[PDB]
Design a protein around this ligand. Sequence first.
Ligand SMILES: *C(=O)CCCCCCCCCCCCC
Ligand SMILES: [Cl-]
Ligand SMILES: [Zn+2]
Lengths: 29, 21
Amino acid sequence: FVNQHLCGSHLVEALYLVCGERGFFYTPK
Amino acid sequence: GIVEQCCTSICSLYQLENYCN
Ligand SMILES: *C(=O)CCCCCCCCCCCCC
Ligand SMILES: [Cl-]
Ligand SMILES: [Zn+2]
């Protein structure tokens, strides 16, 4: 799914901002 | 996981905070 690949890119940049010093985890599966 | 919850619907910043460490 390209549109899923595109969405994930935007999710990781939002997680980066939201989570700040805590960091985050990006698990597709 | 986050793709099922936040790519099928827009997640608020509060919902996105669920995937923080
Ligand atoms: C890994 O395959 C994800 C598991 C669930 C699949 C849901 C995919 C939905 C993505 C929709 C993107 C639409 C963005 C405009
Ligand atoms: Cl896009
Ligand atoms: Zn994009």
